[PDB]
Amino acid sequence: GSSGSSGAIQVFDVTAVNISATSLTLIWKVSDNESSSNYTYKIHVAGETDSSNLNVSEPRAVIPGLRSSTFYNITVCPVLGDIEGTPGFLQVHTPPVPSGPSSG
């Protein structure tokens, strides 16, 4: 057929299976299952006060100790050992916490 774009590791189908107030499970689909070995995902969370990050070997990654009612920007970058693909971006919106702090 042709040769140009086809042939590259890119994280697509990035969606949140579960979005809690202080936690959220992330999921994505990789265009490689046969040689899905030595696959690593570099997560980079960016909040408002501070940012976080975590590396996993699975297409999923939950973010503990999260904040409710706050925008978050997660970037899942695939890494098959010594390779670098395209970072998967997915906007998430944590639900409003039914609990509010009472000062005084």
From Swiss-Prot:
Subunit structure: Monomer. Interacts with CTNNB1 (phosphorylated) and JUP (phosphorylated). Interacts with FLT3 (phosphorylated). Interacts with GAB1 and GRB2.
Residues of the full protein shown: 366 to 456 of 1337
Residues listed as glycosylation sites in the UniProt record: 18, 33, 38, 55, 73
Family that this chain belongs to: Belongs to the protein-tyrosine phosphatase family. Receptor class 3 subfamily.
Domain Fibronectin type-III: 10-98
Subcellular location: Cell membrane; Cell projection, Ruffle membrane; Cell junction
Disease: Thrombocytopenia 10: A form of thrombocytopenia, a hematologic disorder defined by a decrease in the number of platelets in circulating blood, resulting in the potential for increased bleeding and decreased ability for clotting. THC10 is an autosomal recessive form characterized by decreased numbers of platelets apparent from birth or early childhood.
Post-translational modification: N- and O-glycosylated.
Protein name: Receptor-type tyrosine-protein phosphatase eta
Function in brief: Tyrosine phosphatase which dephosphorylates or contributes to the dephosphorylation of CTNND1, FLT3, PDGFRB, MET, KDR, LYN, SRC, MAPK1, MAPK3, EGFR, TJP1, OCLN, PIK3R1 and PIK3R2. Plays a role in cell adhesion, migration, proliferation and differentiation. Has a role in megakaryocytes and platelet formation. Involved in vascular development. Regulator of macrophage adhesion and spreading. Positively affects cell-matrix adhesion. Positive regulator of platelet activation and thrombosis. Negative regulator of cell proliferation.
Expressed in which tissues: Expressed in the promyelocytic cell line HL-60, the granulocyte-macrophage colony-stimulating factor-dependent leukemic cell line F-36P, and the IL3 and erythropoietin-dependent leukemic cell line F-36E. Expressed predominantly in epithelial cells and lymphocytes. Enhanced expression at high cell density.
